[PDB]
Design a protein around this ligand. Structure first.
Ligand SMILES: Nc1ncnc2c1ncn2[C@@H]1O[C@H](COP(=O)(O)OP(=O)(O)OP(=O)(O)O)[C@@H](O)[C@H]1O
Length: 245
């Protein structure tokens, strides 16, 4: 592949990452081209190989496809799937808060994607609104596996205790579900030392509108001990989820 093999379009967003809307000059295939600068990649490397390898190989309608990649003298290019509706982060800022049906639905799609990921021993470890995209029909799509392996408010007590490998994505899930329905992370604070303390002792409360069913699921996902969090299968079969998704 060569940069010459694509027509460049308008910019879709942006670190060293300038992501642009592009179209393969051969079949007009619309996709997103992420550009990464080597100087800025070295300056701060393999953290990127980590991605490419992982994501290239994944394949779930709810996981952003990495069709391939290539390099130049100073420019590395990741050829990704194009997500028409932008990020869930922006959507949440626009709606301020999601209803139970949208939330349940996003959680369902996200658990199906993670289930798929975990069945392949791949853990995202960086699930948050900014890393979730929406496809042409509003289908949630997990992206940026740069932290994946084989955000402060969304990190589990096991990543702040002193980093682990398997029920950290369930914690992030329970956090995300809360932020979806309430409009703000459950441990949000003005300070680092307090969001750290609040997460360390799992100190959070629910407004008064968050329903019982949601409270139940979130409470189960935000357990201090990993083993005590539910399996993705339990999430999918939770009453609140099946009744609202
Ligand atoms: N596949 C995609 N579909 C839609 N637009 C996207 C896609 N990837 C990136 N964009 C947009 O471009 C922005 C920048 O992309 P991205 O966050 O990956 O850049 P970055 O600074 O390189 O981040 P990271 O450190 O995770 O690699 C995103 O926040 C998003 O709005």
């Amino acid at each position: 592949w060569a940069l010459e093999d694509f027509e460049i379009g308008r910019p879709l967003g942006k670190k060293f990452g300038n992501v642009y809307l592009a179209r393969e000059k051969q079949s007009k295939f619309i996709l997103a081209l992420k550009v990464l600068f080597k100087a800025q990649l070295e300056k701060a490397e393999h953290q990127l190989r980590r991605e490419v390898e992982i994501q290239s190989h994944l394949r779930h309608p709810n996981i952003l496809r990495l069709y391939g990649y290539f390099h130049d003298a100073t420019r590395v290019y990741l050829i990704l799937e194009y997500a028409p509706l932008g990020t869930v982060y922006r959507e949440l800022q626009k709606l301020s808060k999601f209803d139970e049906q949208r939330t349940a639905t996003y959680i369902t799609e996200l658990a199906n994607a993670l289930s798929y990921c975990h069945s392949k021993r791949v853990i995202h470890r960086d699930i948050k609104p900014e890393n979730l995209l929406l496809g042409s029909a509003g289908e949630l799509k997990i992206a940026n596996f740069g932290w994946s392996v084989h955000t402060l408010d969304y990190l589990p007590p096991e990543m702040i205790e002193g980093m682990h490998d398997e029920k950290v994505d369930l914690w992030s899930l329970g956090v995300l579900c809360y932020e979806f329905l309430v409009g703000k992370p459950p441990f949000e604070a003005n300070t680092y030392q307090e969001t750290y303390k609040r997460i360390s002792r799992v100190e959070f409360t629910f407004p008064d509108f968050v329903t019982e069913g949601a409270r139940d699921l979130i409470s189960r996902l935000l357990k201090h001990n990993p083993s005590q969090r539910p399996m993705l299968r339990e999430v999918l079969e939770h009453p609140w989820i099946t009744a609202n998704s």
